[PDB]
Amino acid sequence: RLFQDRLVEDEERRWTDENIDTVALKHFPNIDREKAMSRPILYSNWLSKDYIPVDQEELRDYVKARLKVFYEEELDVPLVLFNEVLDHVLRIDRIFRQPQGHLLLIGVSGAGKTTLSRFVAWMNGLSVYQIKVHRKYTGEDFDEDLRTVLRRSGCKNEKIAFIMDESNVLDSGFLERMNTLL
Amino acid sequence: KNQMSTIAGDCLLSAAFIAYAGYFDQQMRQNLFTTWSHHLQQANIQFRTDIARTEYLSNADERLRWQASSLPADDLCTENAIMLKRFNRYPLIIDPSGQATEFIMNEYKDRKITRTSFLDDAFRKNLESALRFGNPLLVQDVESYDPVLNPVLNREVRRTGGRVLITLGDQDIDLSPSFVIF
Ligand SMILES: Nc1ncnc2c1ncn2[C@@H]1O[C@H](COP(=O)(O)OP(=O)(O)O)[C@@H](O)[C@H]1O
């Protein structure tokens, strides 16, 4: 979830996975491999209250079930579920449930971004805050927005999926504010 | 009956011509169409080998309408006039001639269309007034691009009810098959 996800190439992902297997078998002796690691190593806090290992059939049944209940809730356009969007939804939920999570999704335009996040925020009870852009958009308005969302997150004890686009990052001096915020 | 039996390759290729090959010139348009047709013939779909896009997708009624209109006798511009109607999302017209403006403001009269552009002074509030009204436009010369119409170009999903559609920034939107902006 930390390293194999970020790599561009499927060959790089395969090399990372097989070396994960290699290091696990090298420094975890006398342990059966078929239980030590498998292909669907997936965890969620929804099947139980523990991150129990989840097999392909039950996780796919869950993902069909959640999309079936999400059909009539918000999205009138049918979201298509498959091997990559399932993985990305579980990755984004793991990052949301982790403390101080902060995810950099690098990929082509459209393709699932700002709809996977909106969907996950809707099914997890989070709030969505987006920044509008006018002319002469100074950093003071952004600072006020950051102050209000920080007081909502801390003072009003409310988990926030603060989402930002490439259209509200045109200025330069306020970019490093998120750096020290992280 | 034969058209139902071999509608597959032909209408798939015509729709793919509308979708993908709109940026390219006549040479690349025809190269894409012929390569697609050869591969579809190799895909056990035996269709009309001799098909032109203006004779398959569109009809001679609108062909004669555009020929008798101010549009000149030229296959590229008649094909683009066909593309002006068989589209889905808001397009751009990359043109050095700019003759589409008189087309739009000549065949668009009953909607009380307004002449708007990008470099004019009537854009800091006329764009907002056009968003409030819900009227089509042909704003031109995109070199000082306004990032506030990205939600309009993006067509977000927000369902609350039903009225005259406009994809605003910070206000509720609706759905209707009436308005489209160029
Ligand atoms: N896996 C997917 N299944 C179905 N539709 C998808 C998928 N990924 C992206 N889309 C579609 O691609 C479009 C691009 O999304 P995007 O424009 O980023 O959403 P937004 O309108 O919030 O900006 C969306 O309208 C979405 O319906």
Tokens for A106?
């690098």
- What one-character-per-residue DSSP string does B5-17 give? HTHHHHHHHHHHH
Task: Count the neighbouring beta carbons within 10 Å of the beta carbon of residue A100.
Answer: 6
In three-state secondary structure terms, A42 is strand
C-beta atoms of B157 and A135 within 8 A: no
Q: What is the 3-state secondary structure (H, E, C) of A66-110?
A: HHHHHCCCCCCCCCCCCHHHHHHHHHHHHHHHCCCCCCCCCCCCC
| Residue owning tokens 């996800």 | A5
Burial class (CB in 10 A: 0-12, 13-18, 19+), A168: middle
- What one-character-per-residue DSSP string does B76-119 give? HHHHHHHHTTS--S------SS-THHHHHHHH--TT------SS
Compute the C-alpha angle A43/A45/A47, nearest 5°: 85
- What one-character-per-residue DSSP string does A118-181 give? HHHHHHTT-EEE-----TT--HHHHHHHHHHHHHHHHTS---EEE---STT---STTHHHHHHH
Q: What do you get for the CA distance between the two ends of chain A, in Å?
A: 20
Distance CA A80, CA A110 (A): 14
Q: Which of B89, B121, B148, B170 to mutate to test the interface with A (most CBs of A within 10 A)?
A: B148
| Residue owning tokens 């939804």 | A89
Compute the C-alpha angle B21/B22/B23, nearest 5°: 100
Which among B27, B31, B125 has a CA at the least distance from the CA of B76?
B27
Which among B76, B87, B67 has a CA at the least distance from the CA of B29?
B76
Q: Are the CB atoms for A97 and A66 separated by under 8 Å?
A: no
Q: Which residue of B has its CA nearest to A118?
A: B157
Determination technique for this entry: cryo-EM
Resolution (A): 3.4
Query: Which of B159, B169, B170 minimises the CB distance to A76?
Result: B159
Residue type present at position A100: Q
Tokens for A48?
């139980």
Q: Cα dist. B148→A109, A128, A134, B53, B127 in Å?
A: 18, 19, 7, 36, 9
Q: Are the CB atoms for B24 and B48 separated by under 8 Å?
A: no
Which among B69, B61, B62, B10 has a CA at the least distance from the CA of B36?
B10
Distance CA A16, CA A7 (A): 9
